[PDB]
């Protein structure tokens, strides 16, 4: 095995260089030299050794250094630290994929494996962002900010936005990671909050005010998506507002004894009736519900 040793030899140079880049020591390196070595492995049918080597050198760094760095920052500038590790790794992987460019062109697709950058993304995703303790802390930090901003507090909206975008990219041009790690609990947590909110609003004891309070709630949640969250979450958060605050309480809003639609429809409140039509038209059977309470009333007169 002497061709073994030659290829081991070339891998050895690369691995060393890769590690320097990981420690941001790249200035001393030669792009020509590194690219040429990487090219020579693939050219000689050893793309697998190169590919599986790249996997270990990147996995080793993320486990040992990047993750420890993040775990050192729970409850201590956690988001800034995660985002900083995210940017460093993006910069590193951009240098690395380029040195291994020949591989992305000649080996990767032909062998049904992820290109270099995406293999990079997959490891960051699985080793840092989805490490047990980090994943928990990311999720509750984000949710806790949203829940406090709801209550009046002022929170870093940029930080949330950076965290979401990251989750997006980690899903490989799809929303699977953002959805599972952030969106699914966001809605679930949001639903709990709205249902509680509906109980407050119903103490205020006016239909038109409940209806207005809901109109403003939908708008707050849309402006929060546009500014903090992935835009693909707009419709989903709007459906939960509508379910929790309209579909689950619509008969109760419509048949209210003094402020109910019948009360409006006799006390000549055209605007309020209008505000009520706009809101109920959003959900299944919302108008059918209004038309029913109206119909009984119209029927009763004679």
């Amino acid at each position: 095995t002497m061709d073994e040793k030659y290829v081991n030899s070339i891998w050895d140079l690369l691995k060393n260089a890769i590690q320097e880049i990981q420690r941001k020591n790249n200035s001393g390196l030669s792009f020509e030299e590194l690219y040429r070595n990487a090219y020579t492995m693939v050219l000689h049918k050893h793309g697998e050794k190169l590919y599986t080597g790249l996997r270990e050198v990147v996995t080793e760094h993320l486990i040992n250094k990047v993750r420890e760095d993040v775990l050192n920052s729970l409850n201590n500038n956690f988001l800034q630290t995660l985002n900083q590790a995210w940017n460093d790794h993006q910069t590193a992987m951009v240098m690395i994929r380029d040195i291994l460019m020949y591989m992305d062109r000649v080996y990767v697709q032909q062998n049904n494996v992820e290109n270099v950058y995406n293999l990079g993304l997959i490891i960051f995703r699985d080793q840092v962002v989805r490490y047990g303790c980090i994943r928990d802390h990311l999720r509750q930090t984000l949710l806790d900010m949203i829940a406090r901003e709801r209550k009046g507090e002022v929170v870093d909206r940029g930080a949330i936005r950076n965290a979401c975008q990251m989750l997006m990219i980690l899903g490989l041009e799809g929303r699977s990671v953002y959805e599972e790690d952030f969106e699914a609990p966001f809605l679930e947590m949001s639903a709990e909050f709205f249902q509680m909110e509906s109980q407050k609003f119903l103490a205020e004891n006016s239909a038109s005010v409940y209806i207005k309070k809901v109109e403003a709630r939908i708008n707050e949640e849309i402006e929060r998506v546009m500014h903090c969250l992935d835009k693909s979450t707009e419709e989903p958060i709007v459906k939960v507002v509508e379910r929790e605050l309209i579909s689950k309480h619509m008969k109760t809003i419509v048949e209210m004894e003094n402020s109910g639609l019948v009360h409006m429809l006799k006390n000549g409140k055209t605007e309020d009736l209008g505000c009520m039509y706009k809101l109920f038209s959003r959900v299944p059977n919302g108008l059918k519900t209004m038309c029913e309470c109206m119909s009984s009333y119209l029927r009763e007169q004679g």
Partner: peptide
Amino acid sequence: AMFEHEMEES
């Protein structure tokens, strides 16, 4: 790439 990065050639 070679001239894009902060490497010796650049």
